[PDB]
Amino acid sequence: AMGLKAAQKTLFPLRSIDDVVRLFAAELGREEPDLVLLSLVLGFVEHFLAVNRVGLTYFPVADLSIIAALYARFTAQIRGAVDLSLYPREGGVSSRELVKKVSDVIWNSLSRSRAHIQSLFSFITGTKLDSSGVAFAVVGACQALGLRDVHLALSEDHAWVVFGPNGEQTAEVTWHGKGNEDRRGQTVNAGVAERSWLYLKGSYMRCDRKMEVAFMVCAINPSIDLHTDSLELLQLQQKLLWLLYDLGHLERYPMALGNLADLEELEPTPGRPDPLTLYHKGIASAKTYYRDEHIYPYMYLAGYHCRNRNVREALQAWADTATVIQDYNYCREDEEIYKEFFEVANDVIPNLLKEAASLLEASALQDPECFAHLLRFYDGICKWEEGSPTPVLHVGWATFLVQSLGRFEGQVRQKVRIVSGTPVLTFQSEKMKGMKELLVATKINSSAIKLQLTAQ
Ligand SMILES: N#C/C(=C\c1ccc(O)cc1)C(=O)NCCN1CCOCC1
Numbered sequence: 001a002m003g004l005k006a007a008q009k010t011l012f013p014l015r016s017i018d019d020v021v022r023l024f025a026a027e028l029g030r031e032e033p034d035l036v037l038l039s040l041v042l043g044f045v046e047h048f049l050a051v052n053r054v055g056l057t058y059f060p061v062a063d064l065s066i067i068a069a070l071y072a073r074f075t076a077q078i079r080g081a082v083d084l085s086l087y088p089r090e091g092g093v094s095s096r097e098l099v100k101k102v103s104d105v106i107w108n109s110l111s112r113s114r115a116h117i118q119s120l121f122s123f124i125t126g127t128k129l130d131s132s133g134v135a136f137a138v139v140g141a142c143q144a145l146g147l148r149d150v151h152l153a154l155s156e157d158h159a160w161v162v163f164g165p166n167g168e169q170t171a172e173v174t175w176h177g178k179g180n181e182d183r184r185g186q187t188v189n190a191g192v193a194e195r196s197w198l199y200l201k202g203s204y205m206r207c208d209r210k211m212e213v214a215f216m217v218c219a220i221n222p223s224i225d226l227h228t229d230s231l232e233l234l235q236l237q238q239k240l241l242w243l244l245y246d247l248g249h250l251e252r253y254p255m256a257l258g259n260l261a262d263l264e265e266l267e268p269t270p271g272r273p274d275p276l277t278l279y280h281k282g283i284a285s286a287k288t289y290y291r292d293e294h295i296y297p298y299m300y301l302a303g304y305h306c307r308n309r310n311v312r313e314a315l316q317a318w319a320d321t322a323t324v325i326q327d328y329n330y331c332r333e334d335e336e337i338y339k340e341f342f343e344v345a346n347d348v349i350p351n352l353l354k355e356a357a358s359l360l361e362a363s364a365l366q367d368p369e370c371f372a373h374l375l376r377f378y379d380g381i382c383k384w385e386e387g388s389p390t391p392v393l394h395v396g397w398a399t400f401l402v403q404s405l406g407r408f409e410g411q412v413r414q415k416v417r418i419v420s421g422t423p424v425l426t427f428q429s430e431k432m433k434g435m436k437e438l439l440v441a442t443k444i445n446s447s448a449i450k451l452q453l454t455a456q
Pocket residue numbers: 132154155156157158159255258296299300303
């Protein structure tokens with residue numbers, strides 16, 4: 001909340017990964033974990049671990065004196081710029097005016113001209129923050145001001161704040177993407193209503209304080225350079241996520257579960273659920289709390305199957321991402337999910353299939369199920385295009401669809417009972433409904449298919 005207590009101070013100095021975990025375990029026991037304290041600690045240890053080094057054992061000691069000084073500087077900066085008497089706080093509800101005031105305080109503090117600028121350590125010592133860092137900084141400043149209703153909101157690619165009863169009020173506080181006009185101060189209602197992926201049709205995360213702790217743990221960046229990760233930061237993140245997991249605080253956080261699965265794939269913790277179980281918990285969480293309208297739970301699972309060369313389950317998981325995206329409209333700030341679908345369609349899937357082909361020269365290319373999955377994937381992309389502001393498919397997509405269908409013999413392909421929506425498979429998009437017979441011809445007509453995919 002506000003002000004360091006002896007129950008925290010007594011756990012300093014933090015001389016190890018396990019010392020940090022112990023501080024987090026104690027903070028998560030309290031009704032209201034201190035976001036400013038935890039973010040400064042993570043930012044301090046990350047700052048000094050994210051560098052190449054000589055020396056087998058190293059841990060940068062977080063002395064209480066340096067953490068409490070940075071804490072006091074943050075707390076003074078915010079209390080000293082925000083007079084709460086000028087803001088009626090009726091009913092335990094912050095006003096949009098107050099919320100935008102705190103956001104402006106943070107905003108006006110940032111430098112005017114990358115990695116490891118996500119924490120309040122970065123804010124206080126270098127006045128630099130990345131996009132979701134700003135939003136987290138606004139929530140921490142509000143907690144420092146006693147505004148118990150201001151919370152972090154997160155989609156799969158953006159962050160803002162919610163407040164009021166049950167977080168019914170929303171406010172943009174940070175930037176998104178590169179050249180877009182500032183929306184700070186506005187509600188997210190337009191983004192929800194335009195059906196963009198960026199705002200998840202309203203099925204976005206609304207954090208309590210413990211989920212905000214989970215967010216800052218997911219925000220740890222172990223990357224030192226393009227070829228190197230800090231093993232210490234990976235281990236710290238993995239232990240903190242298991243701590244959050246055990247306390248139930250990842251229950252409504254699919255991306256944290258996927259992150260935890262990836263970490264367990266990297267180095268499994270003895271006695272813990274295996275990565276596959278964790279990926280499916282993330283999917284279960286998205287189905288339970290978020291109407292199965294998230295993309296990444298299936299993208300996480302697909303990547304895992306891809307790495308493990310389970311071609312069938314990878315394709316199925318990728319088709320699932322497309323079955324989710326088909327209900328959205330592609331909008332002008334949804335580029336990241338476009339880039340991902342693009343890469344999957346025109347890079348990952350072709351190479352995975354090329355690797356499969358090279359193997360039969362010396363078996364999923366013979367699975368009709370696998371071909372069904374590939375069709376369902378492309379049908380979702382086409383249906384996604386329908387009703388969308390900007391076009392999705394283009395000639396590049398066309399080149400690799402035909403190349404990927406070619407990896408299946410007409411013998412294989414002919415065993416799938418394609419059905420126009422009005423292994424058996426039903427189509428929902430006009431384009432795929434269109435060229436359905438073309439997908440099963442013993443001779444793929446490249447030009448026809450290429451044409452119908454690129455149609456308006
Ligand atoms: N890119 C990516 C991410 C995940 C991913 C990518 C590929 C996969 O195959 C599976 C998962 C990811 O979650 N990024 C951070 C999301 N934040 C949301 C709040 O603020 C904006 C950033």
